Amino acid sequence: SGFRKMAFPSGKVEGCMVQVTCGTTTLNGLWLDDVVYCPRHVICTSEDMLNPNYEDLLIRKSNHNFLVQAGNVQLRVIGHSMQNCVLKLKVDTANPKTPKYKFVRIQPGQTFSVLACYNGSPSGVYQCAMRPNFTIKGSFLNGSCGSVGFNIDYDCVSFCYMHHMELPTGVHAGTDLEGNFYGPFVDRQTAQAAGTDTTITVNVLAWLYAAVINGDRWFLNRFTTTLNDFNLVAMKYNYEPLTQDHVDILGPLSAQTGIAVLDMCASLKELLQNGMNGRTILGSALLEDEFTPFDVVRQCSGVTFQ
Amino acid sequence: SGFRKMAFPSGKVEGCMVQVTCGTTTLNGLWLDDVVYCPRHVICTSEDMLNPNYEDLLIRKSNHNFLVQAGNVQLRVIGHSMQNCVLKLKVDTANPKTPKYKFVRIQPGQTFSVLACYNGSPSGVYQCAMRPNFTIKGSFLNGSCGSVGFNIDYDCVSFCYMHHMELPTGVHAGTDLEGNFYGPFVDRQTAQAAGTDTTITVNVLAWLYAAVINGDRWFLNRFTTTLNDFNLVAMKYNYEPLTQDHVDILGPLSAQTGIAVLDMCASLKELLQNGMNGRTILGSALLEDEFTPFDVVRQCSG
Numbered sequence: 001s002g003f004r005k006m007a008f009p010s011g012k013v014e015g016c017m018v019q020v021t022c023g024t025t026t027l028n029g030l031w032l033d034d035v036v037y038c039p040r041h042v043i044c045t046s047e048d049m050l051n052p053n054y055e056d057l058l059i060r061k062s063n064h065n066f067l068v069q070a071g072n073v074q075l076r077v078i079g080h081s082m083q084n085c086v087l088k089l090k091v092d093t094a095n096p097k098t099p100k101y102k103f104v105r106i107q108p109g110q111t112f113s114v115l116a117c118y119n120g121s122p123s124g125v126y127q128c129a130m131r132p133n134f135t136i137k138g139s140f141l142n143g144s145c146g147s148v149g150f151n152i153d154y155d156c157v158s159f160c161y162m163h164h165m166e167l168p169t170g171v172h173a174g175t176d177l178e179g180n181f182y183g184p185f186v187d188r189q190t191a192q193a194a195g196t197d198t199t200i201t202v203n204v205l206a207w208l209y210a211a212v213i214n215g216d217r218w219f220l221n222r223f224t225t226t227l228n229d230f231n232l233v234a235m236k237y238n239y240e241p242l243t244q245d246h247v248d249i250l251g252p253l254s255a256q257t258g259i260a261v262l263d264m265c266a267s268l269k270e271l272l273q274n275g276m277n278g279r280t281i282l283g284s285a286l287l288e289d290e291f292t293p294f295d296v297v298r299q300c301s302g303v304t305f306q
Numbered sequence: 307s308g309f310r311k312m313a314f315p316s317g318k319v320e321g322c323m324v325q326v327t328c329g330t331t332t333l334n335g336l337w338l339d340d341v342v343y344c345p346r347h348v349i350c351t352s353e354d355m356l357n358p359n360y361e362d363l364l365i366r367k368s369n370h371n372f373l374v375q376a377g378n379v380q381l382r383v384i385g386h387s388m389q390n391c392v393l394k395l396k397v398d399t400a401n402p403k404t405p406k407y408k409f410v411r412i413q414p415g416q417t418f419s420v421l422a423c424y425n426g427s428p429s430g431v432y433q434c435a436m437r438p439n440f441t442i443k444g445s446f447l448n449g450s451c452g453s454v455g456f457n458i459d460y461d462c463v464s465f466c467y468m469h470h471m472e473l474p475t476g477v478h479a480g481t482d483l484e485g486n487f488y489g490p491f492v493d494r495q496t497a498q499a500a501g502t503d504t505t506i507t508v509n510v511l512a513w514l515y516a517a518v519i520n521g522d523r524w525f526l527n528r529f530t531t532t533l534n535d536f537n538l539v540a541m542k543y544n545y546e547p548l549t550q551d552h553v554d555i556l557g558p559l560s561a562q563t564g565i566a567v568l569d570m571c572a573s574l575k576e577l578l579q580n581g582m583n584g585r586t587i588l589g590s591a592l593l594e595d596e597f598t599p600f601d602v603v604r605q606c607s608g
């Protein structure tokens with residue numbers, strides 16, 4: 001029993017984090033096979049930045065400029081190239097700690113563990129959620145660029161994120177491992193912010209199902225709504241429209257809890273209106289939207305990810 | 307910027323987890339050097355649940371009774387001893403993944419990470435705090451015995467918790483790696499219950515300093531309070547008393563933010579008499595108490 005925000009065991013990823021240095025610029029890199037991936041903003045000087053020309057800035061370089069630091073062993077770079085906003089440094093040695101891995105791109109509302117590293121040395125791990133505004137509410141000090149977000153499926157590490165920058169609002173923005181930025185952003189210093197965020201409704205309903213599994217059953221009413229009626233109330237309170245796909249995903253939790261979706265959307269409708277009346281659900285004084293429905297199965301029913 | 311709950315990279319502990327099986331009992335084991343640490347409850351059966359004589363049951367097992375499984379590799383147990391509530395198993399191979407480790411015993415209010423493991427297979431990692439009542443509000447299922455709590459300090463793993471049992475309230479009780487239980491609990495099925503939990507005050511004040519560092523500033527006042535007038539109010543709200551030590555440990559946060567500790571104690575005193583009038587601190591609508599002044603300084607700026 002008990003419920004916590006849980007991340008995947010970051011062991012497999014820690015062996016791939018390396019330090020990449022270009023000029024005075026230093027950040028973290030992901031070393032898989034004989035290639036090191038890092039933000040392409042590493043070849044940037046404050047003299048460029050602002051309005052860059054990465055393709056241009058790129059070619060005019062060398063292979064001894066990039067100091068790929070793996071621990072205190074150095075790596076000979078033998079070729080660079082771009083791929084959207086991610087730079088790939090080809091090095092002479094395959095990473096012997098390379099896991100089963102694939103690059104994936106996540107939809108908003110999906111969750112992933114973040115291994116925040118500073119100067120190639122992993123420092124902390126936590127569990128994030130892709131916000132609807134395509135930002136993540138991370139905790140990143142300076143020099144966090146190159147920190148990677150991932151998930152683990154059996155023994156396959158699914159790299160879905162790479163850190164790039166903090167917005168002035170305080171949230172963070174990055175790309176997938178193929179350079180495609182998450183959201184309406186570019187990798188430079190301009191005044192940038194994204195759309196006003198919204199609650200991931202499907203994750204809140206999965207969090208309520210976890211509270212019922214943990215005996216926290218006070219919010220359960222006796223009523224039932226429709227997807228049409230719920231989404232109309234959901235729009236008012238900056239909640240994401242719940243769709244039919246979202247419903248089917250909550251199927252297992254419904255049958256294992258004995259409740260029902262829409263019946264749960266009845267409780268959430270009331271909670272979105274009355275508030276919680278000074279009570280707490282799983283000890284939280286808000287509504288949590290950082291647990292996907294599969295996250296709740298992994299933490300209450302559960303499988304191990306070695 | 308941004309303030310998250312942050313556990314340590316569980317990489318070094320994953321390489322130490324094994325699966326210990328004694329008869330039909332299968333919990334997780336901590337493989338360090340040529341010794342495998344695990345809760346001594348693994349040597350129990352159905353009849354031995356309420357009042358086990360573990361010394362009787364231990365001089366009651368042979369080395370061939372223990373099955374240790376690091377991945378596909380079965381390990382050969384060549385000795386079984388007991389120190390308090392943890393069973394120690396000599397194996398003929400040392401774990402080549404063994405880190406720089408040391409066994410420490412934390413005090414209530416100290417935080418640590420937890421690697422939840424099932425059948426020697428790590429499944430997840432999260433951040434706990436040792437509650438003042440010596441339990442932890444962890445997340446654990448059946449098969450999670452042997453899961454360890456830890457902190458990491460310059461690639462040196464400090465093992466400070468080993469999960470043994472879940473209490474009726476749903477909180478969890480375990481031992482240090484020397485087998486000494488945290489709290490008035492014993493590894494038996496005797497109906498047990500922990501004292502009434504309280505909020506770690508010094509952790510809340512540390513979290514409030516972390517909010518002001520992050521520019522957050524919806525909750526400060528012009529007031530100050532005496533340490534005894536603060537403790538008098540905090541105790542009325544199931545809060546821990548604040549010692550002169552706790553005031554000194556909050557020293558460097560009071561320095562880096564220019565807000566004296568007793569000034570912040572007044573800002574907390576006001577917070578408890580009103581609530582939050584809707585507003586949130588660092589995204590929380592409740593007061594956080596699982597960030598030590600160490601973690602707060604760790605995660606925050608300079």
Ligand SMILES: Cn1cnc(Cn2c(=O)nc(Nc3cc4cn(C)nc4cc3Cl)n(Cc3cc(F)c(F)cc3F)c2=O)n1
Nearest residue numbers: 024025026041140141142143144145164165166187188307
């Ligand atoms: C507080 N915070 C939250 N997230 C971040 C991530 N982040 C970062 O780590 N570094 C950045 N600029 C650099 C300065 C360097 C100085 N040296 C010696 N080396 C440096 C390397 C970097 Cl990468 N930035 C700023 C930033 C980085 C970008 F890649 C980008 F496209 C726009 C930006 F404004 C940063 O946000 N820090």
Ligand SMILES: Cn1cnc(Cn2c(=O)nc(Nc3cc4cn(C)nc4cc3Cl)n(Cc3cc(F)c(F)cc3F)c2=O)n1
Nearest residue numbers: 001330331332347446447448449450451470471472493494
């Ligand atoms: C739901 N939950 C959350 N945390 C825990 C911790 N925990 C555990 O993992 N296992 C326990 N009993 C066992 C039964 C077994 C059945 N087989 C085949 N093998 C078994 C092994 C164990 Cl270890 N317990 C109960 C428990 C374990 C103790 F070590 C103890 F001293 C008293 C207890 F009541 C448990 O709490 N479960």
